Design a protein. Structure first.
Length: 219
């Protein structure tokens, strides 16, 4: 059901420091090559009064290139799909919590995202729009119980670093649990190398295009 070229549609509803917004977008990519693009539009609550960069990692793990000897748990979960739940703890106390549902309908992936950002300092780089994209990251994957049923799901941990417009960096610690909707084979521990670029945007980041390349490899 996962072809060599796949499209997706995404909707996000969120709030950051109480500012509510909605985003609708579409994407496409090559799931076995690990590459994908997305075009997002802010349909309500724009222009966003905070940095786009805290949203960009929430817009697609079916598109991670995996070697044949690492089970591709998230690809195997389809057509039913999977859910994920993420916490990002930023170094100045801001927090982003995300929940997401991924399914396959009419030959396309369907993503539904709910996001809540809290406690960003009013004078910090997120609320002041002083960020300039993510450095490449490495997510460390491992099987572990993330939902209290006693059975392992797939967990990931990332140390992420955002570049600052005025010079410097700004760090976040991220934990995600990925949960298949049907029983499928979990891998052992491995790592995923990820690089996400904003490839174009209008001046106020209400229409934004992203590109991501992601590849799983042995530890
Ligand atoms: Ca579990
Ligand atoms: Ca479970």
């Amino acid at each position: 059901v996962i072809k060599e070229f796949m499209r997706f549609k995404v909707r996000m509803e969120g709030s950051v420091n109480g500012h509510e917004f909605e985003i609708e977008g579409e994407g496409e990519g090559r799931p076995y090559e690990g590459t994908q693009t997305a075009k997002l539009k802010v349909t309500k609550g724009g222009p966003l009064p905070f940095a786009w960069d805290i949203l960009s990692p929430q817009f697609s793990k079916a598109y991670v290139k995996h070697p044949a000897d690492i089970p591709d748990y998230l690809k195997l979960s389809f057509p039913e799909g999977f859910k994920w739940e993420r916490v990002m703890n930023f170094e100045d106390g801001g927090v982003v919590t995300v929940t997401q549902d991924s399914s396959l309908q009419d030959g396309e992936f369907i993503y539904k995202v709910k996001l809540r950002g809290t406690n960003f300092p009013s004078d910090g780089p997120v609320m002041q729009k002083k960020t300039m994209g993510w450095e490449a990251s490495t997510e460390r994957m491992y099987p572990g119980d993330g939902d209290g049923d006693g059975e392992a799901e797939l967990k990931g941990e990332i140390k992420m670093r955002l570049k600052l417009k005025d010079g410097g960096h700004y760090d976040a610690e991220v934990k995600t649990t990925y949960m298949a909707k049907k029983p499928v084979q979990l891998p052992g521990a491995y790592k995923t190398d990820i690089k996400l670029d904003i490839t174009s945007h209008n001046e106020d980041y209400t229409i934004v295009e992203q590109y991501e390349r992601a590849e799983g490899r042995h530890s």
